[PDB]
Amino acid sequence: MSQSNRELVVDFLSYKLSQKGYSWSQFPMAAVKQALREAGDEFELRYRRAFSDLTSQLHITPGTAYQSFEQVVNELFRDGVNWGRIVAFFSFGGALCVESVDKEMQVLVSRIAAWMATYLNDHLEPWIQENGGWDTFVELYGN
Numbered sequence: 001m002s003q004s005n006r007e008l009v010v011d012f013l014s015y016k017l018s019q020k021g022y023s024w025s026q027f028p029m030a031a032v033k034q035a036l037r038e039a040g041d042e043f044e045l046r047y048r049r050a051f052s053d054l055t056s057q058l059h060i061t062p063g064t065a066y067q068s069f070e071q072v073v074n075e076l077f078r079d080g081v082n083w084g085r086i087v088a089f090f091s092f093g094g095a096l097c098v099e100s101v102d103k104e105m106q107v108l109v110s111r112i113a114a115w116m117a118t119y120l121n122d123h124l125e126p127w128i129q130e131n132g133g134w135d136t137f138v139e140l141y142g143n
Contacts, residue, residue, distance in 0.1 A: 002121050004029060004134075009093065009116040012036055013109065016094035017101070026106045027113065032134045035142035039087045040094065050095045060096060060108060069115045074123075081127035083140060089116070089124065 011033045014024040044050075058064065058072040073092065076085050093116045100108035128134065 005120045006117045009113045012090045013094055013097050013113055017097060020098055022101050026109050031138045031142055035138045036090060039141045040091050043087045043091050051092045054092060055095060055099055062107060066115050070119060073119055081124060086124055
């Protein structure tokens with residue numbers, strides 16, 4: 001569902017910005033949020049590169065349009081959707097927000113959240129609903 005997914009993005013990015021010492025101002029669900037926060041932390045511990053290729057492939061400016069974001073995020077899903085790649089997506093968004101703030105383009109982090117919502121609702125929800133919904137995500141990743 002569209003509205004839950006906006007909340008979920010904003011939670012994950014607010015969590016990452018907080019965690020890495022940044023402002024988050026420029027913006028059962030609680031189980032899904034906790035599980036997703038933990039999943040992103042584990043993911044980033046294993047893979048440390050922070051999607052440096054994908055982020056420079058994107059080359060994000062305020063002139064950058066959703067279609068460009070979409071093209072680059074599709075790289076994560078060249079072999080289709082799985083749970084791991086959904087976590088990577090949330091982690092990629094987080095890395096982009098960090099980059100945006102470091103480059104003094106705080107304006108992009110609310111735009112990135114909207115892009116992530118649209119992309120999640122459009123390309124990922126169809127697979128999530130097929131494979132047991134966010135209940136399955138929690139079953140799989142949650143404490």
